RNA sequence: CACAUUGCGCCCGCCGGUAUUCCGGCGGGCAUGCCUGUUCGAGCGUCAUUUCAACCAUCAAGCCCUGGGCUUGUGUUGGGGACCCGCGGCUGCUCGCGGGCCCUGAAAAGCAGUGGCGGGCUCGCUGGCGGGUGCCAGCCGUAAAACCC
């Protein structure tokens, strides 16, 4: 009914009333959030945080894929940005808690397995390329799935951060976001075997290495002193490759 | 020839004055209840 | 074979040769066309003559675009009777009227050097021009030397 | 009783909770049929797998020639010398 | 003053315009039902003069009754029957 | 002509209820913490007829699909008698969406701003020439009688069924 | 059917491109930009229908033929001249690193034998380029962002980015980043 | 719903019996005309829909005798009136270039005249060469160049 009223006003020429009815309609195209509140649906589908953690598998698979994917009408640019933000926040929780356990590289991408509250959680992240969209691939179905799992992961991150004690949502700065901080754009403040492997080391990443996966792994298992080339983005501990206080350096050039 | 020219002129006139925009049985449509 | 002449007046600025050709060739087939422009400056005098192949087409076009409001200009489209069409009216039709810098030509003609022996016999002639000035200044009472 | 006028620019300038706040265990209904989890990744999938898994050139030719949606497995193992040489999967989104 | 213009026009009933309108409108009413809801007054001046207001609650219904007599004459009117 | 008239009248459309409430709230807030005469399109049969009889309306636009027609059947004659330029536009919904209603039977332009006085005068000239000359040619004659093939054939059938032998 | 209104409209428009091009030609170097060799993204958008021959050729050279295209160009003197010429039909600005990453990853393609190929493997990257030392997509990003000696070849390799209409969203400096976010 | 038999339908929910499917029971509902409103519609009923918009320099650069001034920033509807001028040609009559005065709705009924460079078109000769062209929404001022490629 609201959409019919918006079209009715637009066909009359009342642009101000059309805009007011649109902000009442709360389109995802502008909001960046799902069109409908699905809180009660998530609550009834998963009456337990354990069940939420058990479907968090497909939740993360969806969200990482659509955080990497280009923008369409079914899933807008702001919604993709929110997907990326939620994935990065979940990655920060994993880094802080050292919940990440095992990893794998395949012709399919990269597999991550973590353990949150006794539940094994797997997901596949594609390699940073231009993923092909060929054939009769319908993004509206995947858009509905994306909205559901965005709400689900948002509530999951809230509960995780509240349980650990850190405040949710983490502060996020558009300046470093634009300058390309990716995971380095979030500062985590509080509220008022795993972490030893690379702890007392210092790592540098060359321009030919996967920055997001390598950084996720190293932050999850300890390395607190990581740098990379300026092209890779902000947040590097040291940008100068000449700096002699670097222990290990990653190369994939012939 | 002459008929074609007259038809083209009349079509242009109509476009200038009015613009360019211009089973079988019946059942009650199922509306929302 | 009945040619048809239409006179179009109160033309908006920018309703020139090619625009006229396109529009009235959408209406029909244009054989000849000539806007009226000033020789001094290449500016339209806001009227033009279009000579169509078909008289019926000309009549239809005039009836459709007679009192048309275009850019604050109520056009004037009227068919000229064949008895009143002056035989050489489309003398510069289908040609490209050019804008001549007459002032710039007169200038560089003035600064073009030339032997001023004739200009000095003309100095004598402009001295008799000064004689005419003197005779009109006798009523004035102003005497001037050379 | 009513708010005062406020300019549109200021209006535009001006304009989370725990879902399981009261969480209690619930009996599992017997009509629910959960979707099976995807099988873990195997030794075939890695970009540099053990060399015994790799197919021969003739088997690769047959695999590429035979039509899609007709295979036992939707992939063949492939050894790559480096991650930069590892390419993007063609059927990820599909 | 449009209502005054309509008042004079309705006084001129056999005039050409009013006769034409009454003919084509009589054909419509004969095609419709004997009693039907009229969306709006067909004679707005007469309606407003008799007390019709454009509020929510004022309805106009149109009715056709057979004319003539029963040689006995009915004491009430066709208006009363309608 | 419809497009030009509606350009001017869209420039002079009246305020919506939301806009009027916003304006009144603005002045109320200003008073808590001297204007010129507004110029808008006039609508409503009684208001417009009053303007026409008082010669305040400079331009009149009358919808063609008014039913009962008797509400506007006199308007062209009244405008011609009073000397006010008028035109008949296809649309009481077009006219009513020009105003902020569902249907306007007639609208009028009485006074415009100085920035649009020349535009209004040019529209008056255009309307009066390019519409009133043709309607003066054909407005006193009867309409209708657009008999098609079926109607004409039915009428030769009737004439040959009546005028030949018996009546 | 084309209308006389439109005919007069393009006539007056073309008159104004003629006048504007005359001013630019006579005050060659009109754009008062400090001398810096940096990157600007240029997006071909909707404008006036009849493009004069010189802007048409400049758009042909910059590969901004179709509406909503995107090209990376280094700010030289000839480039500044060309952008000032084709200003009405383009929106240009200074890209940031996140925009460069998103454009090259999400909507990045490659040109081979005059054929569009998506940037799906560093193999094709190092086969087309690489004789210049471009082994990977992030090396291409390095050249484009920190413009190097081989920016010309990097740009010619990258096919123009075919963006999408803004889904509810001259020199614009850093706000072209918002525009790229909207169309990407 | 039904001579009303304590019988039979349909929707939502619940209870008890081996119960997700079965049986029985229970609770809340399902008449017609009409009014106001909501929402979903139908109509070879009527209309609109190929967008007449803004888009120079709301100040810049160079200077001088240091603080004011100067320079450059090319942008004008058309037509008419035995009216008043200045300068170029014309044996001369006069015709041009620019002003002074007045009139007119963004008004309008042949008056078209100045020499070229390139490109398009076309014809002849041996891809090439030479001629023409009321053609250039290309330029310039008399050669020619630029544009072009």
UniProtKB/Swiss-Prot annotation, chain D:
Superkingdom assignment: Eukaryota
Disulfide bond positions: none
UniProt-annotated location(s): Nucleus, Nucleolus; Nucleus, Nucleoplasm
Comp. bias regions, Basic and acidic residues: 55-70
Region Disordered, annotated ranges: 51-70
Assembly and binders: Component of the NOP7 complex, composed of ERB1, NOP7 and YTM1. The complex is held together by ERB1, which interacts with NOP7 via its N-terminal domain and with YTM1 via a high-affinity interaction between the seven-bladed beta-propeller domains of the 2 proteins. The NOP7 complex associates with the 66S pre-ribosome.
Recorded family membership: Belongs to the WD repeat BOP1/ERB1 family.
Task performed by this protein: Component of the NOP7 complex, which is required for maturation of the 25S and 5.8S ribosomal RNAs and formation of the 60S ribosome.
Protein name: Ribosome biogenesis protein ERB1
Organism: Chaetomium thermophilum (strain DSM 1495 / CBS 144.50 / IMI 039719) (Thermochaetoides thermophila)
């Amino acid at each position: 009914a609201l959409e019919k009223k918006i079209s009715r006003a637009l066909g009359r020429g009342d642009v101000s009333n059309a805009a007011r009815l649109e902000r009442n309609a709360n389109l995802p195209e502008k909001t960046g959030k799902p069109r409908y509140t699905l809180n009660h649906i998530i609550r009834e589908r998963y009456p337990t945080f354990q069940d939420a953690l058990r479907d968090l598998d497909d939740c993360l698979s969806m969200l990482f894929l659509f955080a990497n994917l280009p923008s369409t009408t079914a899933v807008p640019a702001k919604m993709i940005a929110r997907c990326e933000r939620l994935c990065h926040e979940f990655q920060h929780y994993l880094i802080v808690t050292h919940s990440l356990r095992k990893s794998f590289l395949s012709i399919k991408g990269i597999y991550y397995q973590a353990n949150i509250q006794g539940e094994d959680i797997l997901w596949l992240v594609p390699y940073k390329f231009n993923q092909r969209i060929v054939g009769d691939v319908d993004f509206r179905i995947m858009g509905t799935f994306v909205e559901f799992y965005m709400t689900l992961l948002g509530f999951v991150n809230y509960r995780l951060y509240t349980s650990i004690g850190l405040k949710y949502p983490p502060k996020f700065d558009q300046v470093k976001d634009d300058q390309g901080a990716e995971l380095a754009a979030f500062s985590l403040e509080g509220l008022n075997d795993p972490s030893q492997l690379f702890a007392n080391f210092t790592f540098f990443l060359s321009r030919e290495t996967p920055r997001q996966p390598l950084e996720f792994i190293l932050r999850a298992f300890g390395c607190k002193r990581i740098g990379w080339d300026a092209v890779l983005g902000e947040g590097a501990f040291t940008t100068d490759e000449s700096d002699p206080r670097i222990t290990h350096q990653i190369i994939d050039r012939p | 020839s002459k008929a074609a020219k007259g038809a083209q002129a009349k079509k242009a006139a109509q476009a200038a004055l009015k613009g360019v925009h211009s089973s079988t049985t019946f059942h009650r449509p199922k509306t929302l209840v | 074979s009945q040619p048809g002449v239409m006179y179009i007046a109160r033309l908006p600025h920018g309703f020139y040769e090619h625009e006229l050709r396109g529009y009235f060739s959408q209406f029909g087939e244009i054989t000849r066309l000539r806007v009226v422009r000033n020789k001094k400056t290449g500016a339209s005098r806001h009227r033009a003559f279009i000579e169509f192949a078909d008289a019926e087409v000309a009549d239809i076009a005039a009836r459709t675009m007679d009192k048309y409001l275009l850019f604050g200009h109520i056009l004037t489209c009227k068919i000229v009777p064949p008895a009143q069409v002056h035989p050489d009216l489309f003398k510069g039709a289908n040609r490209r009227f050019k804008v001549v810098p007459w002032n710039k030509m007169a200038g560089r003609q003035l600064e073009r050097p030339l032997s001023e022996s004739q200009w000095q016999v003309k100095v004598a002639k402009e001295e008799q021009r000064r004689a005419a000035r003197a005779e009109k200044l006798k009523e004035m009472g102003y005497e001037f030397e050379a | 009783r009513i708010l005062p006028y406020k300019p549109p620019e200021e209006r535009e300038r001006e304009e989370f909770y725990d879902l399981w706040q009261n969480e209690e265990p619930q009996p599992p209904n017997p009509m629910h049929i959960p979707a099976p989890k995807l099988p873990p990744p195997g030794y075939d999938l890695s970009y540099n797998p053990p060399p015994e898994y790799l197919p021969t050139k003739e088997e690769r030719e047959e695999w590429e020639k035979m039509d899609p949606e007709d295979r036992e497995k939707d992939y063949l193992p492939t050894k790559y010398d480096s991650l930069r040489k590892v390419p993007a999967w063609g059927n990820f989104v599909k | 003053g449009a209502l005054k213009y309509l008042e004079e026009l309705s006084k001129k009933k056999q005039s050409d315009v009013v006769r034409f309108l009454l003919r084509v409108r009589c054909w419509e009413y004969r095609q419709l039902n004997v009693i039907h809801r009229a969306s709006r007054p067909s004679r707005p001046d007469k309606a407003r003069r008799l007390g019709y207001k454009a509020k929510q609650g004022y309805v106009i219904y149109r009715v056709r009754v057979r004319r003539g007599g029963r040689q006995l004459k009915y004491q009430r009117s066709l208006r009363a029957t309608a | 002509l419809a497009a030009q008239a509606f350009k001017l009248l869209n420039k002079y459309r009246p305020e919506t209820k939301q806009e009027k409430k916003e304006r009144l709230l603005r002045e109320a807030t200003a008073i808590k913490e001297v204007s010129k005469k507004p110029y808008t399109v006039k609508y409503g049969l009684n208001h417009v007829v009053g303007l026409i009889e008082n010669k305040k309306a400079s331009l009149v636009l009358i919808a063609n699909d008014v039913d009962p027609i008797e509400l506007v059947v006199f308007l062209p004659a009244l405008c011609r008698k009073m000397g006010i330029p008028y035109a008949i536009i296809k649309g009481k919904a077009r006219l009513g969406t020009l105003v902020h209603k569902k249907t306007a039977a007639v609208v009028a332009i009485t006074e415009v701003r100085s920035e649009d006085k020349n535009e209004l005068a040019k529209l008056i000239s255009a309307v009066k020439e390019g519409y009133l000359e043709k309607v003066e040619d054909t407005r006193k004659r009867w309409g209708g009688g657009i008999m098609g093939f079926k109607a004409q054939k039915r009428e030769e059938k009737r004439k040959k069924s009546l005028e030949t032998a018996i009546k | 059917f084309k209308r006389a209104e439109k005919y007069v409209k393009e006539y007056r428009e073309q008159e104004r491109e003629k006048i504007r091009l005359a001013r630019i030609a006579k005050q060659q170097g009109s754009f008062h930009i400090p001398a810096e060799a940096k990157l600007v993204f240029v997006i071909r958008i909707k404008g006036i229908n009849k493009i004069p021959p010189k802007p048409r050729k400049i758009l042909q050279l910059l590969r901004l033929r179709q509406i909503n295209n995107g090209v990376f160009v280094k700010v030289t003197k000839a480039t500044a001249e060309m952008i000032k010429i084709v200003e009405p039909w383009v929106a240009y600005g200074y890209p940031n690193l996140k925009s460069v990453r998103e454009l090259i990853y999400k909507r990045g393609y490659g040109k081979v034998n005059g054929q569009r190929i998506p940037l799906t493997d560093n193999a094709i990257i190092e086969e087309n380029l690489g004789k210049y030392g471009i082994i990977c997509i992030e090396d291409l990003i390095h050249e484009i962002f920190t413009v190097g000696p081989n920016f010309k070849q990097a740009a010619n390799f990258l096919w123009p980015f075919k963006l999408s209409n803004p889904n509810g969203g001259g020199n614009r400096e850093e706000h072209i980043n918002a525009l790229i976010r909207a169309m990407n």
